[PDB]
A paper describes a structure:
After extensive rebuilding and refinement, two [name] molecules in the asymmetric unit could be completely modeled into the residual electron density. In addition, one SAH cofactor molecule was present in each chain. An analysis of protein-protein interfaces between the two [name] chains in the asymmetric unit using the PDBePISA server identified a dimer interface that is formed by the α-helices of the cap-domain and mainly involves hydrophobic interactions. In [name], this motif is also present and involves Asp70 forming bidentate interactions with both hydroxyl groups of the ribose. The N-terminal tail of the protein, which is not part of the canonical Rossmann-fold, wraps around the bound cofactor and the side chain of Glu4 forms hydrogen bonds with the amino group of the adenine moiety of SAM/SAH. In this conformation of the N-terminal loop the cofactor would not be able to enter the cavity, indicating and necessitating an increased flexibility of this region upon binding/release of the cofactor. Structure examination of [name] located a cavity in the vicinity of the SAH binding site. Hydrophobic residues are arranged along the central part of the cavity, directly above the sulfur atom of SAH, whereas His and Arg residues are situated on the periphery. The lowest energy docking mode places the coumarin moiety in the vicinity of the cofactor, whereas His120 and Arg121 are situated about 3 Å from the hydroxyl-oxygen at C-7 of the substrate. With His120 playing the role of a general base, the positively charged Arg121 would stabilize the negatively charged intermediate.
Author numbering:
A (entry chain B): 1 to 229
B (entry chain A): 1 to 230
Write the structure that this text describes.
């Protein structure tokens, strides 16, 4: 079965690869800008991993109030060390994206709630979007970008997928993790269903889901919504 | 929780009341004329109820190709019998306004797609408008007129609401359903959001939401758009 967290040497390796390849976060940062991210806002990043996005965002936007959340304590610890390494004061938090638990003080407070390359791992996708919309304030936006199931790739997209898999500088284990993460990723319609389910509970004034590739290097699923005011 | 369909004897009763109050549709019929309705067009009515609009429209515009759709089979049942009773030839279908399922043959075919006093009942309002824009031809129009949430009534508007309820010739059980329908209605801004959303997915050349009362007897929300040309 699919595994949710990334732990131990897997996580150190995820952090080594990631923080050298900053370029590949640019797609996500650009969506945030399009989503209305701005100085002084409160931004919650669910499944924050080793903190790369947090370092990028604080560097670009020193004004932001950032809270990273991850289910893997090791990731939380790596992130804090990485923050210290970069001389930054960032809040990291142990937590499950599938529930508000441990984040009750953030309920209705985030200007933006976001997750990068993580929600495909969730056991209950609708619960992830539920947590996002409950954390975000009325009028605020949520953004998820995560992996698409292998069955929704067309021929050119799949060629690009295999080519991407080959061209990366990762080992046997980390190749398999990333491929397996697509084996178990939700389909496009699964994303649309999950977000629709979450919006039945917390109304949105806008929603949108699509698949493209604007820089990461394979197609990923974009899910955007704005909580109704 | 809010309910979508109107069923059984409540639908028989709905029909009994509507049957003898054609005048209450004049406001809606007048808006269709403003929307560009014309003889020989194909017109889909979503959430058609017991078919009163279809009887009125076929009488006023005899060669319109009218398709009524409703989630209540009993409403469909009623509508069909009522059309036969009136000696008219009219297609009624079972279906959900929140999706094109069962209406794929109408996709992109309607010159007008309309719904009267029903969209406030939908669980997913944006999907209602999506089905509307998808059923209409490029260059065609959509019109929804439906109920306003109680929170968007100003004082005079609300006084009217109470007075309308009082002086309607109908029983306790009917009043409550009509009141509850407003209790659960979208706010004005919810209508604006749901239509913009539907228009993000199917482009419009024109749209407009407003609130007034030109005949029905309370303020209702009007939603109009024209699908962009191909
Ligand atoms: N249910 C859950 N709640 C919170 N974090 C979770 C989670 N399931 C998996 N994760 C975390 O999701 C992350 C996937 S890797 C993505 C890390 C980071 N968002 C980035 O883009 O670089 C891991 O850190 C993993 O521990
Ligand atoms: N999701 C849905 N899809 C189709 N019809 C629906 C629906 N939700 C409610 N309805 C129908 O909406 C109608 C509301 S009563 C309005 C009837 C008619 N339009 C008229 O103006 O007289 C009922 O017949 C009910 O069954």
């Amino acid at each position: 079965m699919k595994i949710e967290p990334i732990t131990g040497s897997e996580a150190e390796a995820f952090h080594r690869m990631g923080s050298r390849a900053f370029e590949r976060y640019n797609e996500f940062v650009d969506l945030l800008v399009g989503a209305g991210i701005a100085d002084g806002q409160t931004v919650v990043d669910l499944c924050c991993g080793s903190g790369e996005l947090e370092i990028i965002l604080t560097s670009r936007f020193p004004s932001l109030n950032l809270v990273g959340v991850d289910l893997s304590e090791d990731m939380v610890r790596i992130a804090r060390d990485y923050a210290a390494e970069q001389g930054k004061e960032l809040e990291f938090r142990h937590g499950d994206a599938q529930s508000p638990a441990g984040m009750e003080d953030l309920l209705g407070k985030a200007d933006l709630v976001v997750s990068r390359h993580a929600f495909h791992r969730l056991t209950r996708l609708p619960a992830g979007f539920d947590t996002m919309l409950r954390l975000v304030k009325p009028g605020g936006a949520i953004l998820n970008v995560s992996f698409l199931h292998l069955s929704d790739f067309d021929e050119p997209g799949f060629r690009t997928w295999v080519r991407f898999l080959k061209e990366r500088p990762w080992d046997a284990e980390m190749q398999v993790a990333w491929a397996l993460a697509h084996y178990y990723a939700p389909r496009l319609q699964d994303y649309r269903d999950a977000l629709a389910q979450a919006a039945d509970e917390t109304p949105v004034s806008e929603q949108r889901i699509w698949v493209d590739d604007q820089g990461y290097g394979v197609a990923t699923v974009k899910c955007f919504a704005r909580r109704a005011a």
